[PDB]
Write a protein that binds this ligand. Structure first.
Ligand SMILES: Cc1ncc(COP(=O)(O)O)c(/C=N/[C@@](C)(c2ccccc2)P(=O)(O)O)c1O
Ligand SMILES: Cc1ncc(COP(=O)(O)O)c(/C=N/[C@@](C)(c2ccccc2)P(=O)(O)O)c1O
Ligand SMILES: Cc1ncc(COP(=O)(O)O)c(/C=N/[C@@](C)(c2ccccc2)P(=O)(O)O)c1O
Ligand SMILES: Cc1ncc(COP(=O)(O)O)c(/C=N/[C@@](C)(c2ccccc2)P(=O)(O)O)c1O
Ligand SMILES: [K+]
Ligand SMILES: [K+]
Ligand SMILES: [K+]
Ligand SMILES: [K+]
Ligand code: NA
Ligand code: NA
Ligand code: NA
Ligand code: NA
Lengths: 431, 431, 431, 431
């Protein structure tokens, strides 16, 4: 059973709590799109673990590379190069858009965002950073100072020079222009404000292509592009955080490629390590060079570690080779339909959005008022689990809670439907 | 050969530079206390990789656990518990001093320091942090704002409320009291200054038991204790960073245990993951509880990941079981002697210090002036490599450069001597 | 002549420049609504000096009190009370709205704003301050960090926690709601943003009733009130800066009295000292009491100085007694008409706004595009002077430049017209 | 009587409290070295009011100029020059040391310090400011962020980049070097610390020649000079705050002239306005020019106001003409003797220090322990008043309280003795 008192005792005894509620179960294992409790119940994993596992749990491929490097070239002195590392950096420069040339191999996405931030500060000679008001970039310093969806209160001043502008939100729009959501004018309008608040030290703007934690918010057609122009105009970099959007999830190797808009620095992590702690940043050779004349430093213990580097390559590989970017479009599409189908059955389903295998369903009391469904969201969520389907709901202020659906790119068709089905059920029971 | 032009081309083409110089070689593998280039030359690893590898490269044990979890329970949703995790947290609460009860399982040491910092801020309601002027805590935000040994310039204001006090340095003392280094009075004296600079928002003091990057600086007899009293007095926590000192390196499971002084939060990483990216913090159940009433949040992708958690346990295990804490005292002692022996041969050897398997040798032009040996340090360093022994020199302002010697706790006797020998040679050639 | 080479030499030799252009003349004297150059040309003063002189230059009354105290009770030890001081504080508590009880007697408006700011910080336990994006509060620290109309660049980070929201601007509105300027929704909308940027440390909002330097921007009907509710809602004070609006200029003793909305702290200076350096703040007895349990400190050299205190009382007096608050409505009205009249003659006159004897005329290229008239504004300005009428134009980004008309409350009818006339002329010549 | 209930009622009713205790009396007038209560008791003014009145109360000269300008050229538009202004700026450039060329005419000393600070920030492109730990510069922003003697707690973060170093204190020295107070090494030692804390943004160091509020602390022989070299070395300005030291008080027109060391910017206020609110800064023509290419702005209401400008000139004049700089040495000397004489009588008199007519007497329990005399200081103080002599005691942490004696430069011999005498009495009664 999931009841091991000792387990729970200790769990109670020795764990720091750091957010949310602990799932009442004891996950004994995980394969493909499933995890299994201490009872052996298979739980359909619709979040790809913590939104990482892009090949699912325990993909034989990773298992091979892993074992392999673990016993061959594990960890090294940060100033010693090895193959995996050069291979990965290169691949990366290779599969990323033009203008992305050099990479830095780290461990976490907050980390990756910090590396990025420091780098723009170093190169602009500036310190002011701007993000979305519903952004999420990490638990650490800069990353954290740029994070607005949550975690700002009770932990001291943020980093000097932190600003945020509202994010273009077609579902709950608030900027009218001639009777329409002129989200482009919003942009303008925000920036003029920011402009007015600047000490004249704009260094960058950081952004998630689709705000995951912020509620699956997709930057509307032309935004990014407009955005980019905003930075360029003010001598700021545009850092694109693809911790969740990167690596095929949205149906392209990289979300920014959808807009055909390439940032100054791009950052990767979750989907890159596919469950393992590997992160990275990528930038143009020009920016790198300058960072370099300027002494850029971001030296870590695991910066450039063979084993981790090994793993992302393999991932990368697999991805390509299995055409998972596309598999993600297919299934992503299969899922949507299903979602809309439930949306047809159920009124509380106020919205179906996202891209690829990254969708969110917004819960409302009534479509007409788009009034957030309080408690409802979680009942559904709660019921899913009973039903043996793992899910994730996000609740910000101002909006119905959002289920964040992000199943493995290796997910199967059947797997899809199943989720879909348990969901309708859970919606059924939940009302 | 180490000459693969393509390798170097790409390396040149696609790598972000983030500090130092890249070793001109191509590390093909690593076992026990050695790494091996593309030619097959075995290089004696005196830094334990990036000061992590406490069981050396590719310890069969880790290789087993690793493979094992990789294929069984890899990565999970941050809000789902598993065995490795509870086991590790517990062990940890167990092998740490009394008063350390609950743990948080993360990935990096900067990370771990950030988690810690936020936590004191959250619990004190304050934001001012104080470290040593030659401190090193990480590349990220808070960690970085607390880091004084290096990296402060050209990247914007630091975090609000950052201060530093000089570190008790017996080798290059600057505080006289009745014709002696009254480092205790220094303490007092600094603090009164800090006190005077505070907005009245002292939240914590963060410190490395022995300043590694700062030049292997050991907090003198009674310091820590005195220090602790300084915090307690001002309602501040004392966070102890044992990224390098922790886990047996200094000859105790934990350096703070040497002083018999237990901090408010302790942080682990390098030596904990033994090469792999695993980190942690540990705190009292009281502090945890409060952090918790207060909403402490530090949610990550890899917070509480089975595979990594798995690995540290094994490490931990091995350590105990192989009595490596002690092996570290033994060999650590074997090494020192040797060091002093060279010190007997060579005048440029101004100082031999450290603890356990963490020693540093300070290079001077003359013992009498303790004038840093410029270029010398690196020649030696350079020559070691030729000799096929990996080493690390640190050069701060004000002091002869320091070799930081930190070989695996699994290092052999012979291995020791060998290093020792190549070193004398390298010193010989270097003069 | 205005040509004294020596004068100009020295002027060139020894003056720090601190903004704008120096009037090419040598003001020998000033009486009533006029200043006179070294040639004896009388210059009609439409700005009340630097927008202070509310009784004009050298009002016999002030001259009496001044002389008087100068020779009786000049300056004292900040901790010694005298009559003028208690009298003034009282009057003030008396002529200000209910809820304004205790006063602090200082010297400048920046000063006064600083005293205010510290006081809210002290009492809320918070540090975040919010102003208008086109605000002006002073050259000093906090005042300066809250100032957005200008002076933010090249002088370092601003004070931690500084934000701004756009100001309700009916002339160049940018917030649509159902095809109308819903400036109320703007409010809401801004605040939600701010809310999202807060570290949870909102202490206050500071605001000019009518943005003087920002272009004579009058807070639209219901704004203030709405605003106040915004603060109250978030536990913030509302500080009202009446450096220019206070003391009868807008046609009420205090602008806030127009809205019938009373702030947490009110600040006075320019119009209070009527040319002399006297400033003040006023707050409720409750806020004062608390500031006091909390150790509020704002001790100066001239805090509570008899002579200055003497002067404001007299002013105050005179004002009442001469019913200048009303005289300001009358003439203020006389002026407007005239303005609109010119507005009838001249298209470049895009807008006539303000209150009382505080009006501004916005210069545009064409009414239809409201495109700022570049150079034009200054020609007019330039021509006025030729014509022997002193004027002031303000030019922010985004809007036609604004003449800021603020003649003495003691101005005469004829005086009015004259200005009016020289203005039409100057407009005539300027096109 | 001093008992006017109404007076006290209102006083209670409507005064903001801003530090200290209100003298229980009602000052009806003030002439020469005296103030007089509502009973007519003459109180010997040993603090020159709030340490300003350098010609005493109501000097006929000021009374003349004052009346004069009040009725001729009172206040003007900040961008209009007049005689007094150019005259004063010039005089000033004239009586100040070489290298001080251009002046800015403001109203307060905090103001003056702010103007200064912004100016160094503007010209260095930096933002970090460094002062003494027992400094006092003003109640406002920057001034306040640089103030360490007091007022730092409970009012939010200070300005970004604020540091302090201990002040050279011969009376309670804490820096030993070979058994002596090597205050020079202290300097060095502090700076190395600061250096280590800098983000690399040192813009200036600000300092009082003699720390008035900090306890009459005189920068020891060679300090200033050493100091200056410290700045020059790091590209920082040295701003000298002579609010109290300036204008003849220490026995030179300017304290810095004593050291023969000229700062980058010098600031004046208290002693400059001799009771009236006039302040200023003075800088080299080079710094001014640059500030100017860079857009330096510090525009106020009273910047460059004829009346105030008029007053300081007159002061200045008088000073010269009456050879008060010297009168201050004479009497200053007369006072000291007297002080030491009491010091001979009384053990609680631990120290007699200062310069010119700026001395302080430190109260101790015993000379041997230099243990601050708690309560004692104030009894004396309290008794003085009874005796009808106004005095001021300062009590910081770590030191016996200090009477700050600063009588008018116009003080008489007899006046001196009298003070002296009431003091011995008060000491007598107080024990
Ligand atoms: C006490 C301490 N805490 C946290 C960390 C950071 O851990 P992470 O890097 O994994 O986040 C380090 C690591 N610093 C290194 C990489 C470094 C790098 C640059 C300067 C000094 C030391 P080094 O091993 O050479 O000392 C450390 O010493
Ligand atoms: C865009 C983005 N960038 C960086 C990161 C941080 O990566 P690391 O955690 O590994 O450093 C995250 C991860 N955030 C999680 C854990 C989170 C947690 C809390 C609030 C929102 C999202 P979630 O997966 O639930 O979205 C992320 O979304
Ligand atoms: C060196 C210095 N610079 C600026 C100023 C400020 O001038 P303004 O007050 O006019 O702006 C002062 C004045 N401080 C007094 C009021 C004070 C008050 C509180 C603590 C210490 C000293 P004090 O006269 O008692 O010393 C000062 O000493
Ligand atoms: C609302 C407000 N509050 C405080 C102050 C500052 O008072 P002090 O200057 O005396 O401290 C001013 C004065 N600003 C002037 C000098 C200015 C200067 C520069 C930009 C805008 C306005 P202006 O008169 O031209 O508007 C002010 O308008
Ligand atoms: K590494
Ligand atoms: K996890
Ligand atoms: K006073
Ligand atoms: K003026
Ligand atoms: Na690319
Ligand atoms: Na323990
Ligand atoms: Na009132
Ligand atoms: Na001079």
């Amino acid at each position: 059973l999931n009841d091991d008192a000792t387990f729970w005792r200790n769990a109670r005894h020795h764990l720091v709590r750091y957010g949310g509620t602990f799932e009442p179960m004891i996950i004994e294992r995980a394969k493909g799109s499933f995890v299994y409790d201490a009872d052996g119940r298979a739980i359909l994993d619709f979040t790809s673990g913590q939104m990482s596992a892009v090949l699912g749990h325990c993909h034989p491929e990773i298992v091979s590379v892993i074992g392999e490097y673990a016993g061959k070239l594990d960890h090294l002195f940060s100033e010693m190069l090895s193959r995996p590392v050069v291979d990965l950096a290169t691949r990366l420069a290779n599969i990323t858009p033009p203008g992305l040339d050099r990479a830095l191999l780290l461990s976490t996405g907050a980390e990756s965002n910090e590396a990025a931030i420091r780098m723009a500060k170093l190169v602009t000679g500036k310190y002011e950073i701007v993000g979305f008001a519903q952004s999420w970039h990490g638990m650490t310093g800069a990353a954290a100072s740029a994070t607005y969806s949550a975690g700002r209160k009770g932990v001291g001043p943020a980093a000097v020079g932190s600003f945020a502008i509202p994010a273009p939100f077609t579902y709950r729009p608030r900027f009218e222009r001639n009777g329409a959501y002129d989200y482009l004018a919003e942009l303008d309008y925000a920036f003029d404000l920011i402009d007015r608040q600047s000490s004249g030290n704009l260094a960058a703007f950081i952004a998630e292509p689709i705000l995951s934690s912020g509620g699956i918010i997709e930057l509307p057609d032309g935004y990014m592009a407009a955005l980019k122009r905003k930075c360029e105009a003010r001598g700021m970099l545009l850092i694109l955080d693809e911790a969740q959007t990167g690596v095929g999830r949205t149906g392209t190797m990289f979300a920014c490629q959808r807009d055909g808009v390439t940032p100054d620095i791009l950052t990767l992590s979750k989907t890159l390590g596919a469950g393992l702690p590997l992160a990275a940043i990528v930038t143009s050779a020009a920016i790198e060079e300058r960072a370099h004349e300027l002494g850029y430093l971001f030296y870590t213990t695991h910066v450039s570690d063979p084993l981790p580097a090994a793993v992302g390559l393999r991932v990368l590989d697999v991805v390509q080779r299995d055409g998972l970017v596309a598999r993600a479009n297919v299934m992503g599409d299969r899922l949507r339909r299903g979602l809309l189908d439930l949306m047809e059955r159920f009124d509380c389903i106020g919205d179906v959005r996202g891209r690829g295998l990254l969708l969110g369903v917004e819960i409302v009391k009534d479509r007409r008022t788009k009034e957030p469904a309080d408690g409802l969201g979680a009942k559904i969520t709660r019921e899913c689990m009973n039903l043996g389907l793992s899910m994730n709901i996000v609740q910000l202020p101002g909006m119905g809670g959002v289920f964040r659906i992000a199943p493995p790119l290796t997910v199967s068709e059947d797997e899809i439907d199943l989720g879909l089905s348990l969901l309708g059920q859970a919606i059924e029971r939940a009302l």
